[PDB]
Design a protein around this ligand. Structure first.
Ligand SMILES: C/C=C/C/C=C(\C)[C@H](O)CC/C(C)=C/C=C(C)/C(O)=C1/C(=O)C=C([C@H](C)CC/C=C/NC(=O)OC)OC1=O
Ligand SMILES: [Mg+2]
Ligand SMILES: [Zn+2]
Ligand SMILES: [Zn+2]
Lengths: 4, 108, 87, 1266
DNA sequence: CGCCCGCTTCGGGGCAACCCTGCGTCTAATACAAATCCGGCAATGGAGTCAAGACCAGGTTCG
DNA sequence: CGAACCTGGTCTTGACTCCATTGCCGGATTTGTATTAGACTGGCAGGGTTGCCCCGAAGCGGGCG
């Protein structure tokens, strides 16, 4: 997962 | 009809108090190939010298103790299995026989 | 999974805690403090008779006297009709 | 990376996982294949459930037990060795396995094509010998040393060959002297000379044995020398004996390994940039198949280059271990254990690893160690994707163990199967029963079931009331059902809507939301008007009650999914609350007009007054309660509460007789008066016979001109009156009302004479077998027609069996013909007609053979129904795959293009005959241009809805084209805009700005498919959307002009005569089984044809028509050619749904010339992104890549989406997922299939931020008050 | 005018994916060691627990 | 308004009384490892079905002579  | 199972572990349900926790030290251990791993131990506890760290290999404590590196011998050698069933004179006999054999076979 | 939360039991347990706090605080300050520090209802650890005494500066006998008095007190149908359905 | 997983997912990136990460996730090398201490039943240390690694099995408890409370958390008991923490870290943590010899992940080796095979450029069947330890491979070589030293080296090779020759001629001399002494012994004494020559021949045979040994030794030496000369990396020294003889000589000049470590060494000694530049050169220059293979390798090569990956990750150095909870070992009650079937695979890998480790540490001969490494390779391969190569590893019962590649939940294999979901709570099903006393927005509901759905709600509501001291007593009280719980249940069920699925949920109305109201019994009483939507008769079908919980959920179920708000089908805007089977008959009987009936308007003065007029419907109903007026007798009421028809309105009143309290007289039945009291006040009078088509028209008029809350109430009223007058109809089926046509005998005897003479002619041999069959078939079709004609003319018009059918309620005339009359022909099991044929109506009863012949057709029908309902689901799944990401995103794109619709083509005599299929192509659209009249005034301007009035205005003005917007030309990049989509067929208004119109189109296309009885059917539709080349391919022209026709041997010979002209297009290999197009009359040689006229009969494949006539014609072809099918089966599907589908087909372009802009020729890319690339590249020097439109089928389009998270669930999950990894393709989570999976709220409906972030606060004026 | 020689089309083969035509015991233990456990007390020392009293210090009783 | 006595308890001392709870020691059982000496030296999955895609023949028409 990559938040931002 | 019902069939129930159960993992072999209880489920204690207190509240996750984030404030009142037993204080705890940190001991940084080193493996052999220059790896640093850290372990929160309880305060009153003899920080063990060695440790099977997360990395999977052995892990030593960062300080220097060396109470005993190994203090244990190999299990048994093929040399062992041979020696316990022959005499040194016999082994020397076969050795010198091989010596004469290679000699006469190669250089006449 | 026979080792899961019944999911009515969890909310029931929360309600139990809440009514229990209510009923305990229906009493004086020292009584509630003694009960909680005795049965770990605030820090999860039963604090012994002498530790309760030292946190109140009294004897083990003073602690046991207070707890026994409170114990006889709690055991009323008055203080118990609310609770009894939680078992 | 945000591993804690809370509400924040802007992307979800994949990528091939190197060992430096795999051993960074893990919390400890598991190094003993021990599961549980057989007796204590605790995890073993270093085992596949080791608490020391994976975590504690008991909440906040170490293994030795020296810590047991939350006060000791985050710390690790220094004797037992476990992080004292919550017992669900056994669900999250992972372990690794330090392999002894590296391994190749099977997804990168056995897949087709094999990505290892490409990145190394090796033949996969020569890669398998490399990694599975069957054949060596030279991994490195010291080119300069073999170069410079080669003089001396070949010198020693020559010296060695000459030593060969010395041994050779030594043998030669030996056998020579032996055989010469043999001759000296032969001739020295006398004997049979043939024996002496046998001695010579034996000596010479042994000498040729010598020369044979010499030749073989020379051959072997030459083989080894040539191999050493040509030695270079990536060679396969098969048979290992050349390698054995080799290595000892020149071992210091190269390196030759075997197995996965050899592949690792290669990929280490491998520059991706140089290789990719070589491939760029080859694709730039090399022609032929070489360019194809070079492109195919360049794919993975540029994949590794561009990304920040490294192909070294493909060879797996350390296997990771899934957390213990995801592969549990639970014990059923009673001592038995239930493993997860991965524990066995892991035990195999750990055992083989430890054995390899001990073999190496011991020192073992090369054969055994290679065998062990091969076993390790096979074991890890079975662990990852079972039985991919080899025979799957099996357990008991010869069932293959279920490895990790199979545990993926969605995991579509080559064929798209159903997901089948999650099994929600707050659910329940039952059998349904018709509920004819309910309102439209209600549902029966068994209180014994509502009391279990709403149990938490009722527990709360009766703890608020002082009925129970706690929650616990209320739970037990519901368990006992104490009496007042029911009265509480009513108050909790008030206003709380519940849903009602009905599997199979074909289309959007399968789920609807009613207001639950309690009912005795145990059947979910359903309202009878929604059975047409659910496709639900009451033959035992069962419905499912879900329950909405959240406040937003109740709002959705109340406003979006309520029943009374969903009247019109989303497929074609027709109404589905419309009356049907019973109520249609009811209203038909209620509104018909029976002349000569009781108390009619019988005007004859001079002997008495009129005696027909009734002073109002009140007096009329009083009369009809008495036995004077019949309900249907033509009368003359004097109404004051029903707006008269248009004509009488204009006549008597002029402006508008505001109905309300007026007066006027209309001659009708009383029945029509009671009927028009059902309809609203403002609605005009009807005064017709309420046939089903008329009722559909009336409800359309209502729904398109009135609010929905009035349409619902009027539908409900029509339902009630329909049933009530259905009962008084007397439609009963007594066998004295199945009247047989009284002259059936003579008709049958006539046609039997005809067919008998045909059969006798066959017996004459004048016509063959097939001729007589076809003749008899035609005779009996003629006979069936005559019988049906006679039958229909014989039944009176009030016959029940024909009243039902004529009223449009149910059943076509064929079924009445089969009841009385003739069954006609019965199909053979193969499909042909039986020339018998059946000659008895079911009223007469058949004979044995007759029934046995009928059974053929019956069972064929049922079996084909099964297969057809199974294939329609396949089509629907493909469509929802293709168009899941076509959602309205802008109120208007403001383009100017848009297709033009036919709209009632001119007539030859000179008139506007309305085009037949206007209601689906013209209705519900938004004009692009302005309809002008007489080349004069503007009759309908830009951006109107084209409903009934303006279509009628155009047919009045006499114009037969209207350029109207459509999703084919909506310019918004991210899906369609609205006004190009026109009206949504469900609401009647403009489509809102979240409607997942892609999914609606897919559903509406694949819903009526089950009715697609039938290339000419559902497979025609499917091969159309797939865009294969049909079997009946007919070539289309490429330029106008008369035709170059020819009829060669055993088939035709067609050629195009251009008009410029040029190279005449030659169509040689045609089939005699194909025919010329009859058009404009039939084609013949020398016929001037159009540009893309279809020559032969059949179906032009959309690829060719695309290549010929731009994307416009291919769109117009696909839409029309699907609509041909869906009309032929008598079905309405508004064209915009098919258009929304096709607009996905035509998204991409092919790249014939990359120019010099980052594009692989022969590849596929987006038109918008292609345009963007050229917009960028026109600056910084122009190399505009030559692009061409491609019409690619639905499946390939779906698979080539942008979101790997979605694209992996469609087809070949494993293959899509692995190369999504190799690209390292980050997903952005904009579709629907992604958000639905990861729980995030979907970007559609009420998920978009325009609606999802509304603020809501009381207006200041109301805040002041309270 | 006849002829080669790669380009292009279709066939055939070949293979990946899938499912049922698939789905018995193996000598024998002995000998030795080390570890792990359980079994009974000796140490307790702590944890509970009675009885009495001393603090009183605020009611209720008779003057 | 005061002396005499009861009574809430409020603790506090001393006084004991029992349970756990280390710790040792001694034998049981449990678990791991080493050793057996006539000769013995390469098995069976498994097979059928299906559908899709890669490589070779073969017109075959241009490039060629
Ligand atoms: C983490 C994702 C990795 C890539 C995806 C892979 C490998 C899956 O293989 C395909 C996606 C998928 C399927 C996962 C299933 C999961 C997680 C699961 O257990 C389910 C499930 O089995 C069904 C559902 C929903 C009911 C599916 C509804 C689909 C709607 N599609 C749509 O709205 O049309 C546009 O959710 C799940 O989480
Ligand atoms: Mg049914
Ligand atoms: Zn522990
Ligand atoms: Zn648009």
């Amino acid at each position: 997962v990559l938040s931002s | 009809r019902v069939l129930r199972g159960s993992r072999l572990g209880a489920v204690s349900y207190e509240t996750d108090r984030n404030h009142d926790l037993a204080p705890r030290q940190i001991a940084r251990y080193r493996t052999d190939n220059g790896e640093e791993f850290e372990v929160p131990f309880a305060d009153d506890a003899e920080i063990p010298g060695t440790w099977l760290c997360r990395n999977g290999m052995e892990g030593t404590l960062i300080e220097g103790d060396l109470p005993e590196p190994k203090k244990v011998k190999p299990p048994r050698t093929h040399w062992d299995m041979l020696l316990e069933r022959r005499s040194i004179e016999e082994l020397e006999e076969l050795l010198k026989e091989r010596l004469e054999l290679i000699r006469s076979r190669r250089r006449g | 999974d026979s080792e899961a939360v019944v999911a009515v039991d969890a909310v029931s347990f929360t309600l139990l805690q809440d009514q229990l706090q209510s009923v305990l605080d229906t009493l004086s300050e020292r009584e509630a403090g003694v009960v909680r520090l005795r049965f770990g209802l605030t820090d999860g650890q039963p604090r012994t008779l002498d530790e309760i005494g030292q946190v109140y500066g009294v004897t083990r006998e003073r602690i046991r006297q207070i707890e026994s008095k409170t114990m006889s007190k709690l055991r009323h149908p008055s203080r118990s009709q609310v609770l009894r359905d939680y078992l | 990376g945000a591993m804690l997983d809370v509400n924040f997912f802007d992307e979800l990136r994949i990528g091939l996982a190197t060992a430096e990460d795999i051993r960074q996730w893990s919390y400890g090398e598991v190094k003993k294949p021990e599961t549980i201490n057989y007796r204590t039943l605790k995890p073993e240390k270093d085992g596949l459930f080791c608490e020391k690694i994976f975590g504690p099995t008991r909440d906040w408890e170490c293994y030795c037990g020296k810590y047991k409370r939350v006060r000791f958390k985050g710390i690790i008991c220094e004797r037992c060795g476990v992080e004292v923490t919550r017992a669900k870290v056994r669900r999250e943590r992972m372990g690794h396995i330090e392999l002894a010899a590296p391994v190749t992940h099977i997804w990168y080796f056995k897949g087709v094509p094999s990505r290892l095979g490409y990145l190394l450029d090796l033949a996969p069947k020569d890669l398998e010998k490399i990694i599975y330890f069957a054949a060596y491979v030279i991994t490195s070589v010291d080119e300069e040393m073999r170069h410079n030293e080669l003089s001396t080296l070949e010198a020693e090779m020559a010296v060695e060959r000459k030593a060969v020759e010395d041994q050779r001629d030594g043998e030669l001399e030996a056998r020579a002297q032996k055989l010469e002494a043999d001759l000296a012994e032969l001739e020295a004494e006398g004997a049979k000379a043939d024996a002496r020559r046998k001695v010579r021949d034996g000596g010479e045979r042994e000498m040729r044995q010598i020369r044979d040994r010499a030749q073989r030794e020379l051959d072997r030496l030459e083989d080894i020398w040539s191999t050493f000369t040509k030695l270079a990396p990536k060679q396969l020294i098969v048979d290992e004996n050349l390698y054995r003889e080799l290595v000892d000589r020149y071992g210091e000049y190269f390196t030759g390994a075997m197995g996965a470590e050899s592949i690792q060494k290669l990929i280490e000694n491998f520059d991706i940039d140089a290789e990719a530049e070589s491939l760029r050169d080859v694709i730039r220059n090399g022609k032929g198949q070489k360019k194809l293979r070079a492109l195919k390798r360049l794919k993975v090569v540029a994949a590794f280059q561009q990304s920040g990956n490294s192909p070294m990750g493909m060879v797996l150095d350390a296997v990771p271990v899934i957390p213990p909870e995801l592969r549990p070992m639970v014990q059923l009650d009673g001592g038995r254990f239930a493993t997860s079937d991965l524990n066995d695979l892991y035990r195999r890998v750990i055992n083989r690893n430890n054995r390899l480790k001990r073999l190496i540490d011991l020192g073992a001969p090369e054969i055994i160690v290679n065998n062990e490494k091969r076993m390790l390779q096979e074991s890890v391969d079975a662990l990852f994707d079972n039985g991919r190569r080899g025979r799957p590893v099996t357990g008991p019962g010869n069932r293959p163990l279920k490895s990790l590649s199979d545990l993926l939940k969605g995991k579509q294999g080559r064929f798209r199967q159903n997901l089948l979901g999650k099994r929600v709570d707050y659910s329940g099903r039952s059998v349904i029963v018709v509920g004819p006393q309910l309102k439209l927005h209600q549902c029966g509901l068994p209180k014994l079931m509502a009391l279990e759905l709403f149990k938490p709600f009722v527990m709360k509501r009766l703890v608020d009331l002082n009925h129970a001291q706690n929650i616990k007593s209320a739970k037990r009280m519901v368990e006992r059902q104490r009496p007042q719980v029911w009265d509480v249940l009513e108050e909790v069920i008030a206003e709380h809507p519940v849903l009602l699925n009905r599997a199979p949920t074909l289309h959007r109305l399968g789920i609807q939301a009613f207001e639950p109201m309690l009912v005795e019994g145990k059947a979910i009483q359903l309202h009878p008007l929604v059975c047409e939507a659910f496709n639900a008769d009451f033959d035992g079908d069962q419905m499912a009650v879900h329950l909405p919980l959240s406040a937003e959920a109740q709002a959705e179920a109340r406003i979006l999914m309520l029943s009374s708000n969903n009247i019109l089908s989303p497929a074609s805007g027709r109404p589905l609350a419309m009356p049907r089977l019973d109520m249609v008959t009811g209203l038909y009987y209620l509104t018909t007009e029976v002349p000569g009936d009781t108390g009619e308007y019988q005007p004859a003065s001079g002997d008495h007054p009129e005696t027909g007029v009734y002073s109002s419907p009140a007096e009329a109903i009083m009369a009809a309660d008495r036995g004077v007026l019949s309900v249907r007798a033509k009368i003359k009421v004097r109404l004051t509460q029903l707006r008269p028809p248009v004509e009488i309105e204009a006549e008597l009143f002029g402006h508008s007789g505001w109905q309300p309290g007026d007066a006027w007289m209309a001659e009708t039945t009383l029945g029509r008066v009671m009927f028009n009291e059902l309809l609203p006040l403002g609605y005009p009078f009807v005064n017709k016979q309420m046939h089903k088509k008329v009722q559909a028209a009336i409800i359309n008029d209502l729904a398109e001109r009135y609010p929905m809350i009035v349409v619902a109430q009027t539908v409900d009223k029509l339902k009630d009156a329909g049933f009530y007058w259905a009962t008084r109809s007397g439609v009963t089926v007594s066998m004295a009302d199945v009247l047989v046509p009284p002259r059936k005998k003579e008709i049958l005897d006539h046609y039997e004479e005809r067919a008998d003479k045909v059969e006798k002619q066959f017996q004459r041999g004048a016509l063959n077998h097939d001729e007589r069959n076809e003749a008899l078939v035609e005779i009996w079709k003629e006979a069936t027609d005559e019988v049906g004609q006679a039958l229909r003319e014989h039944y009176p018009d009030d016959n029940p069996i024909i009243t039902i059918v004529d009223s449009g309620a149910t059943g076509n005339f064929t079924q009445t013909r089969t009841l009385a009359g003739m069954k006609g022909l019965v199909t053979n099991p193969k499909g042909e007609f039986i020339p018998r044929p059946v000659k008895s109506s079911f009223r007469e009863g058949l004979t044995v053979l007759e029934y046995f012949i009928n059974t053929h057709g019956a069972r064929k029908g049922l079996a084909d129904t099964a297969l057809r309902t199974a294939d329609s689901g396949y089509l629907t799944r493909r469509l929802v795959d293709v168009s899941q990401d076509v959602i309205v995103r802008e109120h208007d794109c403001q383009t100017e293009r848009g297709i033009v619709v036919e709209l009632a083509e001119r007539a030859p005599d000179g008139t506007l005959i309305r085009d037949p299929y206007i209601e689906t192509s013209a209705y519900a659209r938004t004009l692009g241009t302005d309809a002008v009249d007489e080349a004069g005034n503007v009759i309908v301007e830009r951006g109107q809805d084209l409903g009934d009035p303006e279509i009628d205005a155009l047919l009045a003005a006499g114009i037969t084209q209207v350029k109207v917007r459509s999703v084919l030309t909506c310019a918004t990049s991210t899906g369609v805009c609205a006004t190009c989509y026109g009206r949504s067929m469900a609401t009647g208004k403009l489509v809102d700005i979240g409607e997942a119109v892609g999914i609606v189109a897919a559903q509406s296309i694949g819903e009526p498919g089950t009715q697609l009885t039938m290339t000419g059917g559902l497979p025609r539709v499917q091969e159309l959307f797939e865009a294969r080349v049909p079997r009946g391919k007919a070539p289309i022209a490429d330029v106008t002009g008369r035709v170059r026709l020819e009829d060669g041997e055993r088939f035709y010979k067609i050629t195009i005569v251009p008009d410029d002209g040029g190279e005449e297009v030659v169509y040689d290999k045609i089939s005699k089984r194909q025919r010329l197009r009859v058009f404009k009359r039939v084609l013949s040689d020398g016929d001037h044809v159009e540009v893309g006229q279809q020559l032969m009969e059949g179906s032009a494949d959309p690829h060719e028509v695309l290549r010929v006539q731009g994307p416009r014609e291919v769109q117009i072809h696909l839409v029309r050619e699907v609509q041909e099918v869906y009309r032929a089966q008598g079905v309405s599907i508004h064209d915009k749904h098919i258009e929304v589908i096709v607009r996905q087909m035509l998204r991409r372009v092919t790249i014939i010339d990359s120019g010099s802009t980052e594009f692989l020729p022969g590849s596929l890319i987006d038109r918008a992104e292609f345009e963007a690339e050229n917009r960028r590249v026109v600056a910084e020097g122009g190399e505009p890549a030559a692009g061409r439109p491609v019409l690619m089928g639905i499946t390939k389009a779906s698979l080539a989406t942008d979101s790997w998270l979605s694209a992996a669930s469609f087809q070949e999950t494993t293959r899509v997922l692995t190369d999504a990894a190799i690209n390292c393709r980050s997903d952005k989570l904009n579709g629907l299939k992604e958000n639905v999976i990861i729980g995030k709220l979907i970007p559609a409906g009420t998920g978009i931020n325009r609606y999802r972030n509304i603020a809501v606060q009381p207006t200041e004026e109301a805040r002041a008050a309270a």
